[PDB]
Nucleic acid binder design. Sequence first.
DNA 1: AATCGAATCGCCGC
RNA 2: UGCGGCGAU
DNA 3: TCGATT
Length: 856
Amino acid sequence: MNTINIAKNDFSDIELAAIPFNTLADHYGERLAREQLALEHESYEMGEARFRKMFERQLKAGEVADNAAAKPLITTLLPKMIARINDWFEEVKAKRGKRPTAFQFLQEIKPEAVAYITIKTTLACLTSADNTTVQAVASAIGRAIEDEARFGRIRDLEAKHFKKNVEEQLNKRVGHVYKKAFMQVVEADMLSKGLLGGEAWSSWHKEDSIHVGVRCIEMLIESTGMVSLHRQNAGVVGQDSETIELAPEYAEAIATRAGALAGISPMFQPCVVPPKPWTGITGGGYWANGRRPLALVRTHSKKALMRYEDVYMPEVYKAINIAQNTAWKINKKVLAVANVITKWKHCPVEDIPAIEALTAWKRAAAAVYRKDKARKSRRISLEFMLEQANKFANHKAIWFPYNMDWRGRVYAVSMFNPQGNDMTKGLLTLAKGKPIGKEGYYWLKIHGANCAGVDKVPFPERIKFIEENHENIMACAKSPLENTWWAEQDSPFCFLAFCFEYAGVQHHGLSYNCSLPLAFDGSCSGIQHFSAMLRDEVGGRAVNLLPSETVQDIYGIVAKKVNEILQADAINGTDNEVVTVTDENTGEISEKVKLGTKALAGQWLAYGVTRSVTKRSVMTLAYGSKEFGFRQQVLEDTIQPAIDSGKGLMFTQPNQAAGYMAKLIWESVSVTVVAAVEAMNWLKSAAKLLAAEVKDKKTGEILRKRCAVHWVTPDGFPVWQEYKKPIQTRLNLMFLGQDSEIDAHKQESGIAPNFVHSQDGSHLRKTVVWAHEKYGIESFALIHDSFGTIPADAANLFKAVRETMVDTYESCDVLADFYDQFADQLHESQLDKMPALPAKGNLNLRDILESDFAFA
DNA sequence: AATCGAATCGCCGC
RNA sequence: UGCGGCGAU
DNA sequence: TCGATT
Ligand SMILES: O=P(O)(O)OP(=O)(O)OP(=O)(O)OC[C@H]1O[C@@H](n2cnc3c(-c4cccs4)ccnc32)[C@H](O)[C@@H]1O
Ligand SMILES: [Mg+2]
């Protein structure tokens, strides 16, 4: 209940410690040392305040058991509670005579749930309610017990399949009362169908709700010493009451843990000196010896991190330190614009003045509810980014530490960082610029065209777009508030940043010093990498790996292929037929028309199929999506928005149209990018064979335990895949739910997306070192697929990102290297089942050097 | 037989 | 952890 | 749709 302040004797260490001060004062001076270490002192200070504010509000709301400081307390006490409730059940059954009142109520709820609801509600009542009476907390236990018994029978009983239809809207409800009002209208709806056996709940009375709680409190006192019984004015019939007090030893446990956790989570701020170079696993980035040291790899387990101690990966270490050394500064010009517009609009860009009815009304209401929370969540992120940009505005330069995820993608550590949204990217620019020159001016206009959404057109048409709109750009630069043209663009704040740089070149000529980050973003890198490994000519051209006519739109190509089979099916497709299907719950066979492919093609041609229908399906292919996943997508992306808007009259049966759409998209994407589909199948089959435990059926004994998946990337960064699952988990309807084996399903669902994400991270890192050593590039803007630098270095980074990818896949067969990692661990019975390596195609990688639109 | 499930990271909230 | 929402890729 | 889990 009362937590020590860490800052008084412990946060003072990081400012006074001589070794962190000296090692950083040696590099950059004593005065910057006191500023940087005070900034990190503030970083832990605001983080401590975040934990205390959350804990105080959780204490008031009764959600203290949901806080992480109470969690290890719950883990130890609660096995004792389930055994004590299970032992008392057998005691009463052995005893003759009438049962206690609480006995019949207790059996309706699962034994481990009885354990939970008592502890949390006793914690909730002892930390917030100000009433320590036994009677008041027993009724709170029993009322929450009657909740899980009455509405948990929907989840447990013959509605479990139907509960899978009501669970997500229950999860979308925020607050226990809102989750309650939804469960009441659900329960009445199901009773109208006889789904609960027609048995309506008889509400427990107030005397019954106390008896379940009283038996539950004293059963916690028998099992655990958490909670202690006291009597006041005993022997007086008018004033005899019993109170309940939380045990002091358990109070100090959560208080020490809450204090320990508060010093462990700091709010990461940018660095006013260049960040600490990484020499090992830990201690990089920020300079102080803090309570939470930065890890080079963000891992879930410490053991997965300590696997990185011995690996010699010098090129990985060099690339992270080069990215850290990139000097950034706040764009003051766009900050002046952003500081005034956000006062007037909740979102600066959202609203600019410019020239089944039962179910559809619920869906419209759910959109307004989702839009309302989306608005408040979007705004609070904006106010933090603006206050960070205002805080570091006056500094001549700021820096961002970098580390990596377990796949090797590199991320900035500060909460305000250049891998953020458009406004945050707009507020940030590089600090060390050079005179722009003719070539830099060319790429500055190309970057300006990309910010406007003119990325689908060749480079000369991008230049002509800028020069045609020359007067609009200078009008926006001179007065951004008077001309809202820049805000109507695809990347508005980043476009406004281009406008200021474009105006300065017009004012100061080609000698103008420009430090804007000019971003080159790969089109679809997962397919781009996959087509490079297996030499896919057709797939590579679709993702602009080949020098092409125009920019190749893979979404348009798939939509074009879809429209080919659509027109073929409208002529020679199947006719409609009548099929019989039954709901399992209703148990009644009904006859409905199954539309043939000729009718479904006519529906889709009437709607008009463009790249928008095929867009989301192509992106999710690298994440493992297939035909079934596309059906949900095209229903919610295209069919349902059409239906609500007055269109969708062609989609008489929307699920049959969506499934037909999903089949056509999958047939189109599989023949467009064949190496992508083939490679993710081969990786999935590999993780399949390793993640199985191989037992002979007769002996029932393992011949090969469950095996993780490990590969090393061309950079030299090792990566293991170690998806593990807990054995037991427990979930309540109105209350929050709270070694181990390998999750075989997660190993396959993740192997292909993580392998290709590990491939782009190496390519990003190898690009960074190649651009820094072969060319003179010192400033890098990196977002996974995006490569940014100053305009004077833009042409060289254009070459370096191509040169690294050609040099990588000409030197390494990463799939063959992947095979040599796991071939020894394969069981002998699994060897015949393994698919062979996919066949290499006729693609020449040297054409990537001549490809304009790969960008990567 | 019956059933189940169709990428990573960060912030905020419960 | 889980769930809700936001953002990045 | 589609094979793997349970
Ligand atoms: O609209 P078009 O311009 O015509 O076509 P696209 O340029 O291809 O798409 P767009 O919407 O404009 O945003 C593209 C820009 O944001 C990045 N980006 C946006 N969304 C994603 C996603 C997914 C979102 C939902 C499921 S997965 C996954 C990886 N990267 C993404 C892109 O990496 C690019 O940088
Ligand atoms: Mg776009």
